Design a protein around this ligand. Structure first.
Ligand SMILES: Cc1cc2nc3c(=O)[nH]c(=O)nc-3n(C[C@H](O)[C@H](O)[C@H](O)COP(=O)(O)O)c2cc1C
Ligand SMILES: Cc1cc2nc3c(=O)[nH]c(=O)nc-3n(C[C@H](O)[C@H](O)[C@H](O)COP(=O)(O)O)c2cc1C
Ligand SMILES: Cc1cc2nc3c(=O)[nH]c(=O)nc-3n(C[C@H](O)[C@H](O)[C@H](O)COP(=O)(O)O)c2cc1C
Ligand SMILES: Cc1cc2nc3c(=O)[nH]c(=O)nc-3n(C[C@H](O)[C@H](O)[C@H](O)COP(=O)(O)O)c2cc1C
Ligand SMILES: Cc1cc2nc3c(=O)[nH]c(=O)nc-3n(C[C@H](O)[C@H](O)[C@H](O)COP(=O)(O)O)c2cc1C
Ligand SMILES: Cc1cc2nc3c(=O)[nH]c(=O)nc-3n(C[C@H](O)[C@H](O)[C@H](O)COP(=O)(O)O)c2cc1C
Ligand SMILES: Cc1cc2nc3c(=O)[nH]c(=O)nc-3n(C[C@H](O)[C@H](O)[C@H](O)COP(=O)(O)O)c2cc1C
Ligand SMILES: Cc1cc2nc3c(=O)[nH]c(=O)nc-3n(C[C@H](O)[C@H](O)[C@H](O)COP(=O)(O)O)c2cc1C
Ligand code: DMA
Ligand code: DMA
Ligand code: DMA
Ligand code: DMA
Ligand code: DMA
Ligand code: DMA
Ligand code: DMA
Ligand code: DMA
Lengths: 187, 187, 187, 187, 188, 187, 187, 187
């Protein structure tokens, strides 16, 4: 019935990106399935005013990071995509290597084998050859690398305006239209 | 005598990153050599309150984008590094491919052959396999890929605070200390 | 203004190598930051007369293996080098793959992206194609593989004499001279 | 009816490893064929109390390094394996490249084409990309790389104890049990 | 306390390039360690008015090509870099393959493993796929390929002027300024 | 009925090499088709006594650098080979990449697809990994890389002697004998 | 005026192939330049009735294996091709690696760079991955691998009949027709 | 109880090699399973005095080339190895590509997956890059390439003497000793 998208958050800086993804997906009437890593919860508390319990309330369903029996861990579970936002280099490497020992990496591993859209908001700078090799080869395996670089051409008035443009551009990859930002139409 | 760094700006969004790099380098008593692409001047006018003539005044020397006889185009010219900020995918590809048909790509080509530090603030999202292949292989050739992703863990109060942290992290790669941002020291 | 070097120990045999690196680095007035793996602590207990607390007293600062918020885990933290001594195949693989899920592998991951010297005293024999592929490719990413093979040409009288020579050659890679071993100068 | 093993010594430090291999193999009733390089003889004289004449007496047969007509140089010659101990980087590269211009490299070249066990006690530190590429690719061709790294977990009392453990683990690869060292069996 | 640079000469044409490197480094108070191959000595005799004994006098220390126990053959030996000038395809291949069976190739092999600057003035034309593969892959291992192609834009009045510029550009890679050639500064 | 050879000059130093190639080819009764890049004309003026109009007078036919409709730009046009002398790194990369947006790179692109001899006098030092990758891979596509390195073994009396020898060796690749230099015949 | 072909013999079994190549080329009015390795001379003596001096008399010119100043060692020397018959794995590896430390490997190295026909009668069985890697990659560099495998379909009456057929097929690669063997034209 | 070896003959010249393999294996008390391709039967008739029915009588079991249900086509069937003698380039390519559309290529495909010894007496000269790519990559997959090149150093008196030596060296790869040829033991 309703479209399903798995939203995974990891311990890279940029926790507000994952929070605003859940808000935008809820408004778009998308059934969300949230998984938060241990260090994702730590960065949520430290960088934002949200508590992990507040972020869990923004999602239709929540699954435990270590619960490999969760419904989303099986390819038979029907879902239409997954976004890891923000995505740490550790989780990027787990997905690239195939070492799927938690629910985030396993569900991403499953999305790739089932040929479902997987978007990794990989946040790190500068990049080593390890990071770039992982990005290139996971891209060839089917994933989409979305570095959250600001779009300064929108003449933003606040940090939130840039984050809203980024979140809207992320969800474009699932053929979803937030209508929350100004798309380019020339000068 | 004074350290020399070539500062190149291209037509990717984020012109304020290159402007604040020139300001920080001037304060650090670094002799700067500025080159601006045609579309870099266009994005400076459109996203910022600066005019190209204002940015040129922030640099000790300015060289024309099409002047292949400029001093910085020769490896015999002594310089200590180059940063392309912001760096478009087009200029990243010119450097990766070796098609050095303007002063920015030629000077970058020269920095790589002379084994001088070259930093590319490559701004694009999402990334295709073309972008990532260019990033990986130019990295193996010696360049440093620095995607300008914000560091939200600093609890920034403004867009300028995030840009200042990014610029300071860029210049760390030249062993320069702005002292303009708060470095991580735990929670 | 002292030089900072991260000393990481893992659960490969040869715990005395890491202990003597700390002792050396202290005598040369280097500020050492020690991280010990869980199995490093076990190997320290089993094959040396030291206790992990004795090892911690040899370092200027100690960080917990699971504390991903430690200062050394960020590239903004300035450091001059990192040595993993001894380095197990497990940790070598974590660094090669990029699966940086503890402080040793994350700090090493940061050293590579910030282009700082990383020395892996990788101890294992014989070597599989997995080990050698990881060594070769992590070398291309910037790390130095240092197998702790004895230099019998020094005509040592004890195991400790051979360890001292190995430790001295390790620290040569950071441009540090222990002056504790006979450098080669003909027969 | 006796098993034949070619024992080759090259000019890497650690000549005692090859001497003890000859002693251990004689104990095990293996017919040994010794080949010593020119710089192996110099190394034997420098760092051991053995003269090359003493080492030749430890072997059943001795062949000249320059004698490409020696029996071991033909694949039609029955042999069960070969160990280069210690193995220099030069000889590792001769075997990797295929430039078989002396009896050691040619016999190793023959062992690989006849699909016989070839162990290279490659001793060098630190390792360059050249060394590791040669190790990885000669491994894929069928060779076993055995860095002589000490097993400190045996809680040794002398340098000789650690050499004995290494020699025993080397000969494990030929399915031989010296019985002179303590194998791991838990704490 | 002085900087040490190993200067290796091989049997590629261009022996004067190595001779002028030794002279320039002496001028810069660099302690030079010279190794000459067998065919480098033949090339010196044929192409120059120097005898190998004259070239050896230009260096602070000279090591035998066959002496694998020379000080420079160990990584424990302190040194800031090595330049092979001129560098034959044979020696380029020895370094690329790792077949380090003489003092020049072994010392270069050691420079690469110790992460020290290694410059190969590789002289050959035209180039085969063998040469180019060796150049590309040894570059990735850390070496610098410096083909001695003349910089005609200096408007030289003699062969020696072009050689002096090449030698100065070589030593730039060791952060050394001979001050004996005109660096580019736009159109004169 | 005469052989046709395209002579292309680019903005690398060494303009006299291309001028002498034209003179040598004229003496050998070869119909030459000249294309000069914009920066080739500037280098001709700067480092030689020739004017570009003098160089055009040495050729049988001259085509404009931006005229993609020139006869030599089509494979249907009969031609026996092409030499780019001197060849910049920029034009080397244009040919390697296939970005054939001027008459020199397009004609070279055509020579490769029609399996005609293409000689690139690629002049640059030192060489980066970008340059060498382009040289290796364009060689595999069919091109011949000819770095203009002097042949001191001819015991030359002037710069012109060494240039004459290089030019003669260049034209050897087209099975042409200038007879203007001394070929090697032993000591 | 006459065609020049370098004939190189190495220390693989099959010296009679090289001798019969020299006889066939003399009959075809080809100027032959012979180079014999040290182990080719030993092989000639052992498995043929020829003395090396008899083989030298079959050639128009002879050059010493260690004479790097011989005429054929330079690309400036006019020559139409080279055949190494028989070709050892050692010499195959010297050519593949580029380690051209004798006149045979240097002349072959020169033939490849000058784009002249090079035929390697590589004789070894079985083949290792080293041998096949060298064969494949030297082929891509321009060489032709000619294993001297007998053509039994000619219905030979002696060993010499099969040798004559191999020699004729070898020289087919130089566009030469010995005319002393029966080519295939159906049953 | 008895050793089983699959003997496959294909349509390359050298049918007598396959016949003599069958005779040698019968003498060695090895249970042989013969498969002949269509063009091997034509080759047997043309260059030997045997009829295909005579060759079938030399084997213990015979299977039809198109019978994909034969016992040897399954990995569950116990067998100790397989030799394809002689091996055409077509069959070499079928095994390399995996296009196992007859019993010879499928049985070889099975031998590789079950990790059993597979020897390909690949006969062709000269070799293309296609042939050598197939040889190299099928070798890495487990097969042994055995070019039937004669060993002239045995000082043979007839064609059959050289064939007997090749056959004995072939079966050396199955740890079998025909004992009817002189192995090398010096001059
Ligand atoms: C405050 C803080 C910020 C961090 N930011 C990043 C980051 O931007 N990128 C990254 O790759 N890792 C970052 N890390 C490190 C990761 O949290 C660490 O590698 C962790 O093991 C990743 O775990 P996870 O992917 O399972 O959530 C940060 C850590 C902390 C404590
Ligand atoms: C307003 C604007 C913003 C742009 N932002 C980017 C960008 O973020 N990344 C990118 O690769 N190209 C961007 N482009 C496109 C580049 O300007 C374009 O590819 C141009 O050819 C690059 O030229 P240059 O690198 O020589 O300056 C942008 C263009 C415009 C007009
Ligand atoms: C006594 C002992 C000795 C060990 N020696 C080695 C070794 O030499 N090399 C290795 O790769 N692993 C060795 N291991 C196994 C590692 O401890 C194990 O793989 C562990 O997962 C490594 O974890 P760490 O790198 O986080 O310390 C040893 C284990 C024990 C108990
Ligand atoms: C005293 C001494 C110790 C050496 N130790 C090593 C070593 O440990 N590893 C290495 O690759 N080369 C070492 N070498 C250099 C080799 O001996 C040199 O490369 C030589 O050419 C190897 O030749 P071979 O393999 O034929 O014996 C050493 C040389 C000397 C004089
Ligand atoms: C006069 C002369 C000039 C030579 N020039 C070159 C050259 O320019 N490039 C090259 O690769 N080899 C050249 N050689 C060949 C090398 O000397 C030969 O390959 C030798 O084996 C190299 O040995 P080395 O590198 O140890 O000195 C030349 C030889 C001679 C006699
Ligand atoms: C005086 C001068 C000398 C130059 N020499 C070289 C050179 O030797 N090699 C090179 O790659 N570029 C050299 N360049 C830079 C090229 O001219 C520049 O990259 C240009 O874009 C090449 O354009 P073209 O290949 O279309 O002629 C030189 C430039 C100048 C002004
Ligand atoms: C009698 C005899 C036969 C040989 N046959 C071969 C052979 O068929 N293939 C091979 O690669 N090496 C063979 N060799 C070994 C080579 O002679 C040896 O590797 C030598 O180093 C090659 O040197 P060269 O290529 O410079 O002549 C044989 C050696 C001897 C003594
Ligand atoms: C008389 C004759 C001799 C042949 N010799 C060879 C040969 O030596 N090598 C080869 O690859 N093909 C040779 N062929 C071609 C093969 O028979 C042909 O490619 C066939 O398709 C192979 O089929 P098979 O491998 O299934 O037997 C020969 C063909 C004929 C008629
Ligand atoms: C947790 C669980 C039962 C996973 C199995 O589903 P899958 O994605 O591995 O595919 P399949 O339905 O074939 O088992
Ligand atoms: C613009 C110009 C004259 C470039 C030449 O310098 P380079 O970097 O190509 O090196 P070199 O000094 O050897 O010519
Ligand atoms: C604990 C912590 C702050 C980790 C992030 O380090 P970083 O190097 O990724 O920081 P940045 O790239 O934003 O400078
Ligand atoms: C001394 C000698 C005979 C060397 C050739 O060995 P080989 O393995 O090539 O012999 P063959 O392949 O002929 O059995
Ligand atoms: C001549 C000689 C003794 C060389 C050893 O140098 P090395 O670098 O291989 O030894 P180590 O690594 O122990 O310093
Ligand atoms: C100026 C022009 C006609 C270019 C097309 O040449 P082409 O070789 O691509 O065309 P064709 O394949 O028909 O020769
Ligand atoms: C003995 C000798 C002169 C060797 C040089 O040959 P080469 O082909 O390398 O010289 P060049 O490239 O100048 O023609
Ligand atoms: C004719 C037949 C039964 C073929 C199956 O062989 P297999 O080795 O593919 O079967 P399995 O894997 O079940 O042993």
């Amino acid at each position: 019935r309703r479209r399903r998208i798995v939203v995974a958050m990891t311990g890279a800086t940029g926790a507000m990106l994952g929070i605003k993804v859940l808000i935008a997906l809820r408004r778009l009437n998308v059934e969300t399935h949230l998984v938060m890593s241990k260090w994702a919860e730590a960065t949520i508390k430290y960088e934002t005013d949200y508590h992990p319990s507040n972020v869990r309330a923004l999602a239709d369903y929540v699954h435990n990071i270590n619960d490999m029996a969760a419904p989303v861990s099986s390819g038979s579970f029907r879902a239409d995509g997954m976004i890891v936002v923000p995505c740490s280099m550790k989780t990027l490497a787990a997905i690239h290597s195939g070492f799927c020992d938690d629910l985030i990496s396993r569900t991403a591993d499953v999305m790739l084998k089932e040929r479902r859209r997987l978007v990794l908001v990989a946040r790190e700078t500068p990049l080593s050859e390890i990071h770039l090799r992982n990005m290139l080869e996971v891209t060839r395996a089917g994933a989409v690398i979305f570095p959250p670089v600001p779009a300064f051409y929108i003449k933003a008035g606040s940090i939130e305006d840039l984050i809203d443009q980024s979140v809207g551009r992320m969800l474009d990859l699932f053929d979803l239209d937030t209508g929350d930002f100004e798309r380019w139409n020339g000068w």
